Each structure stands twice: as structure tokens, then as C-alpha cells.
């Protein structure tokens, strides 16, 4: 009371399965619009008047849904059916529109690599301490990350960036990165990361010290 959006948030389907969308509305309507908004680029039109057509959308896309519930069903997911789809309704007190349905083509789940990097000389002379551990080429999206230095955990200054979906590997690559200051680096010795993932049982752990140069 009162927000209207599409009901399932983040989906995932292999190329060949059924992709059925579901939009929920705060008030009833008659016509419903559907879009294909790719990441970075402007959205297009996909399905208007709840079923009709578009300019470049294929014949396999189907849609329906009257009242406060809408449904745009893909008959079989292909390589070009991976987009964030939003709905709309012209008004006369707009509801307003929803968020968008992110979805990724499913494949074999791959285990990442965790590359920790020591800070060089030029950063500590300027006075910085930024230890990273780049998680590259994993599947699926979710990793419960942990930064623990010298036995105990550390969660302050931890930043997390998500490189978007790739086209040649079709995986994701993260940058697990915490930021400290130049005096907080010379009191802790072994800097490491554990990547808790559902593929491998034990997280891959690399260690390095400060007394070696």
C-alpha cells in the first residue's frame, strides 16, 4: 500500500525451458505494456495491449493477464531472451510501474579463482592500504564472502562490485575489496579471503606475509 511490481525478483533458466513472467498491480487496468530493457541500453517495446506484437520481437513470445495480474510467457528460452523486462499502465494517477525482471541463461556452475594482491611501494608512500581479492569466473551469482585477518573477522571498509554478464564464458566476476589506511596494514601479516560457494566444499585460500620483499 501502495506499490506495484513484478512478483518474482531474480530468475534463471537454461536455453530451452519455459520463462513465464508475472506482474502484480496495485489497481486494475485493461491494457498492459511489456518491455525488453537490456543493461546499459535504452528499453524497447515487447508486448502491448497485453498480447499484441512488437517491431522485432519473435513469434514465440506470448502474453496475457487481465485485472491486477499480468503474464508474459516465453515459449522456449533462446540466446536472445535474457533481458530485464518491466511493465507499465497509462494513468490517471499512475501506480507507478514496477522494477524489472533480471534473468540469466543457466549453464554449468563454475568455481572461481581468488586473486589477492599485495599493495606496492607507491601506495604506502602516498599512504594507502587497499587489499583486494578478485573473484573471477564463478557461477551462480551468490557468494557469502568473509574477510578474516589473523584469526578474527573484518567487515569495515569492505566494498563489493559486480561486473555484468559475459558473452563468451557466460559467468560473473567480482571484486572483493576492503580499504584500510597505511598504519593499519603494518600490524596485520597474512591477508586472505574465503569464497563460500556451492560448487566446492572448501573455499580456496591463498596466504602471503609482509616480512618478505
Amino acid at each position: 500500500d501502495i506499490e506495484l511490481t513484478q512478483s518474482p525478483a531474480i530468475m534463471s533458466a537454461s536455453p530451452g525451458e519455459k520463462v513465464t513472467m508475472t506482474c502484480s498491480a496495485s489497481s486494475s487496468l485493461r491494457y498492459m505494456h511489456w518491455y525488453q530493457q537490456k543493461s546499459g541500453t535504452s528499453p524497447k517495446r515487447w508486448i502491448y495491449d497485453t498480447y499484441n506484437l512488437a517491431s522485432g520481437v519473435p513469434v514465440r513470445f506470448s502474453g496475457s493477464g487481465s485485472g491486477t495480474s499480468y503474464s508474459l510467457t516465453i515459449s522456449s528460452m533462446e540466446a536472445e531472451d535474457a533481458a530485464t523486462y518491466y511493465c507499465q499502465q497509462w494513468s490517471s494517477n499512475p501506480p507507478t510501474f514496477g522494477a524489472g525482471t533480471k534473468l540469466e541463461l543457466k549453464r554449468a556452475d563454475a568455481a572461481p579463482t581468488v586473486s589477492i594482491f599485495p599493495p606496492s611501494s607507491e601506495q604506502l608512500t602516498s599512504g594507502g592500504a587497499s587489499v583486494v581479492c578478485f573473484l573471477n569466473n564463478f557461477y551462480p551469482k551468490d557468494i557469502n564472502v568473509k574477510w578474516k585477518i589473523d584469526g578474527s573477522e573484518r567487515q569495515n571498509g569492505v566494498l563489493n562490485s559486480w561486473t555484468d554478464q559475459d558473452s563468451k564464458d557466460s559467468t560473473y566476476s567480482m571484486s572483493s575489496t576492503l580499504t584500510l589506511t597505511k598504519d593499519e596494514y603494518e600490524r596485520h601479516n597474512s591477508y586472505t579471503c574465503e569464497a563460500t560457494h556451492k560448487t566446492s566444499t572448501s573455499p580456496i585460500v591463498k596466504s602471503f606475509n609482509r616480512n618478505e620483499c
Partner: protein
């Protein structure tokens, strides 16, 4: 075809009147509803309002009133969507949907970041380790204030394993990443560099990567 796109606007000093210029000329002139769609980096699509050219009726919405005017001029065929008396929350991508049965004809869009900031130059710090077949590379950026930044690797010869990382926020400074993978036959054989640029500060920082 509806030509061509929308215009750009940068950070303006607080108190002046910025103005967008939405240049859709696909005539069709002049009876339609130029609805302006605005979306945050929170991926939600919001509505800024519409304008009508035949008589002059505009509109507004509760989260963007007072005073976002949508002026119309059929001689230049543009639609204006800039909001005055603004705050920092107007830093969002601003589209231009034309009218059909749906919202069929969009523009390309612009993001206008508005504050009272200071433009800070970037600084390339070397991320190189001090063993295995392939080693990932990179160079960190720390503390550039406006969102224009540049991402290159070897100026168009080693752009294979470049992953484009977002500049998520902490302490009002943008921090992204650009990691590339190198094989052991070229490291440290060829001299790899990363050259990032900031258009808003007009500052170029370069660094050659050395094995430590």
C-alpha cells in the same frame, strides 16, 4: 526514422537553470505526448511527466513537482525536462518516451549529476603481485568525484579479458576496477600499461606495470 537522440548536461553550479534538450524529430507533428521516463541506479523506472504541443498542456507527478516545467516549441521540435531547485537525488538517467499505444519510441537518455562538488583527478596505483600459467592484472582507481571515467587496456590490443567493474560509492569517492588476464609468455616480456582518463577534470594519469 525518429532522429536522433537526446542531449547531454554536466554538473552545474547550484542556483543556475540547467535545461535538457530532447531532440526527437520524427514528424508526426505536432500531436503526441512526450512522456519523460527517469530511472535511478536502483533500477526502478519512474515517470517525470508529459507535454502536449497542439494546445500546450503539461503534467507533473508528486515526486517531481515544484517546479519541473515541460516547455514546448514546435519550431525547434524539442521537449525540455530539467528540474530546478534541485538536490543531489536528481542524479539519474533521463529518457524521452514518445506516445503510441505503448511507450514505444524512447530516446537514448542522459544522466545529470547535480551537487556542489569539486572535480578530482584520478590516480593509477599499481596492482602487481610480488608461479602459475596465467596471472590476472589490474590497476586501482581511488577518489575521482564525477562519474565520467575512462577504461582502456593497451589502447585496443589486449581488451580480451577486461572485466568492467562498477564504481560503487564509499566516502563520496568512486572506486571501480579493471582487471585483465596476461599469459606468462608476455609477462614480463611486453610492457603492459593502463591509461585511464577523466573528462571532467581533464587530467591524464599513466603508469607502466613492473613486476615487484
Amino acid at each position: 526514422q525518429v532522429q536522433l537522440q537526446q542531449s547531454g548536461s554536466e554538473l552545474v553550479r547550484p542556483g543556475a537553470s540547467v535545461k535538457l534538450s530532447c531532440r526527437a524529430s520524427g514528424y508526426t507533428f505536432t500531436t503526441y505526448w512526450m512522456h519523460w521516463v527517469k530511472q535511478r541506479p536502483g533500477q526502478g523506472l519512474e515517470w517525470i511527466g508529459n507535454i502536449y504541443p497542439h494546445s500546450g498542456n503539461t503534467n507533473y507527478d508528486e515526486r517531481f513537482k515544484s517546479k519541473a516545467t515541460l516547455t514546448v516549441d514546435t519550431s525547434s521540435s524539442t521537449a525540455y525536462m530539467q528540474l530546478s531547485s534541485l538536490t543531489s537525488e536528481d542524479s539519474a538517467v533521463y529518457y524521452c518516451t514518445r506516445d503510441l499505444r505503448g511507450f514505444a519510441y524512447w530516446g537514448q537518455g542522459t544522466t545529470v549529476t547535480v551537487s556542489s562538488p569539486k572535480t578530482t583527478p584520478p590516480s593509477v596505483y599499481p596492482l602487481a603481485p610480488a608461479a602459475a600459467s596465467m596471472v590476472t592484472l589490474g590497476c586501482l582507481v581511488k577518489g575521482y568525484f564525477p562519474e565520467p571515467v575512462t577504461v582502456t587496456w593497451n589502447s585496443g590490443s589486449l581488451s580480451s579479458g577486461v572485466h568492467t567493474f562498477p564504481a560503487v560509492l564509499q566516502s563520496d569517492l568512486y572506486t571501480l576496477s579493471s582487471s585483465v588476464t596476461v599469459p606468462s609468455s608476455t609477462w614480463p616480456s611486453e610492457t603492459v600499461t593502463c591509461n585511464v582518463a577523466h573528462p571532467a577534470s581533464s587530467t591524464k594519469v599513466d603508469k607502466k606495470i613492473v613486476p615487484r
